[PDB]
Amino acid sequence: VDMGFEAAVAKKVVVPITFMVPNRPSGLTQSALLVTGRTFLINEHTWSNPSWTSFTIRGEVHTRDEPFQTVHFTHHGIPTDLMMVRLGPGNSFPNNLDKFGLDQMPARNSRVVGVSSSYGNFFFSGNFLGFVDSITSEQGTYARLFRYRVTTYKGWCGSALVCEAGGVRRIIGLHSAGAAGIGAGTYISKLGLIKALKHLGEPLATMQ
Ligand SMILES: CCCCC/C=C\C/C=C/CCCCCCCC(=O)O[C@@H](COC(=O)CCC/C=C/C/C=C/C/C=C\C/C=C/CCCCC)COP(=O)(O)OC[C@H](O)COP(=O)(O)OC[C@H](COC(=O)CCCCCCCCCCCCCCCCCCC)OC(=O)CCCCCCCCCCCCCCC
Numbered sequence: 001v002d003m004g005f006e007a008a009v010a011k012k013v014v015v016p017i018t019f020m021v022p023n024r025p026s027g028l029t030q031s032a033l034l035v036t037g038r039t040f041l042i043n044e045h046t047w048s049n050p051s052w053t054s055f056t057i058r059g060e061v062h063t064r065d066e067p068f069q070t071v072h073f074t075h076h077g078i079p080t081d082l083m084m085v086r087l088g089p090g091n092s093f094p095n096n097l098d099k100f101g102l103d104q105m106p107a108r109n110s111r112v113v114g115v116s117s118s119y120g121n122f123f124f125s126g127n128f129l130g131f132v133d134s135i136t137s138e139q140g141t142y143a144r145l146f147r148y149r150v151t152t153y154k155g156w157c158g159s160a161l162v163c164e165a166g167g168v169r170r171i172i173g174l175h176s177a178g179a180a181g182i183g184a185g186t187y188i189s190k191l192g193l194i195k196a197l198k199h200l201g202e203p204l205a206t207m208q
């Protein structure tokens with residue numbers, strides 16, 4: 001059970017983010033995934049909730065009326081729970097692109113490892129149950145997910161999902177939902193990330 005990769009994910013990728021609201025005594029804390037430069041990945045249902053007035057990430061406070069550049073991923077016309085957010089100028093994130101994406105799909109009942117900063121830092125684990133085209137949720141249908149056998153809790157959203165295929169372990173999801181001891185995470189592809197970063201203007205050298 002080598003977790004050198006997952007520890008690297010915990011060290012460089014997963015961070016706490018807290019949404020501050022004028023509706024409730026405390027901020028809603030979850031996880032975010034630093035991608036590169038000034039962009040990170042976040043759950044759509046958290047980002048789009050109209051209540052928050054600021055959020056904190058990597059020691060910075062950002063208000064809602066700031067001009068974020070964002071990409072909301074869809075699949076065959078159905079929304080996914082995945083959002084990409086680029087902040088204004090500031091201290092750069094690590095370049096974590098090498099940690100995302102698998103070219104082969106994980107073998108059924110291989111091990112999924114979640115990497116979370118939602119309650120302090122922790123890992124969770126469960127076996128891969130396969131991809132699903134959609135889930136039916138309390139906030140509607142969401143597209144392009146995969147499921148894993150493990151009981152998950154409110155706040156674990158945004159945790160990185162590390163799967164294995166072809167001898168390699170990579171992040172291919174972030175946690176979205178739970179239902180009766182089975183969690184669901186929204187799928188992340190390297191090609192989607194690359195094209196979203198280009199749309200957002202996140203400067204990257206292209207390997208020729
Ligand atoms: C074993 C054999 C394998 C099997 C084969 C598999 C399949 C075979 C074929 C099958 C049938 C064919 C069918 C196709 C399947 C193919 C396989 C496949 O999967 O292909 C997929 C293609 O995607 C991929 O490439 C993945 C990648 C996967 C594969 C792709 C194919 C390959 C392609 C290329 C191949 C190789 C190339 C390799 C390259 C190497 C790398 C490249 C290096 C270079 C198909 O998926 P689809 O086409 O369906 O979607 C496209 C994309 O995924 C998402 O779209 P996106 O652009 O990113 O979204 C646009 C927009 C962004 O948001 C905003 O910007 C507005 C927000 C704007 C606000 C902010 C922006 C403005 C800024 C403000 C201020 C900014 C300040 C500065 C500004 C300056 C500039 C500003 C910006 C420019 O989002 C919205 O929509 C609005 C969002 C709303 C839509 C949602 C609806 C409801 C929303 C809410 C949730 C629910 C709540 C309900 C309330 C309503």
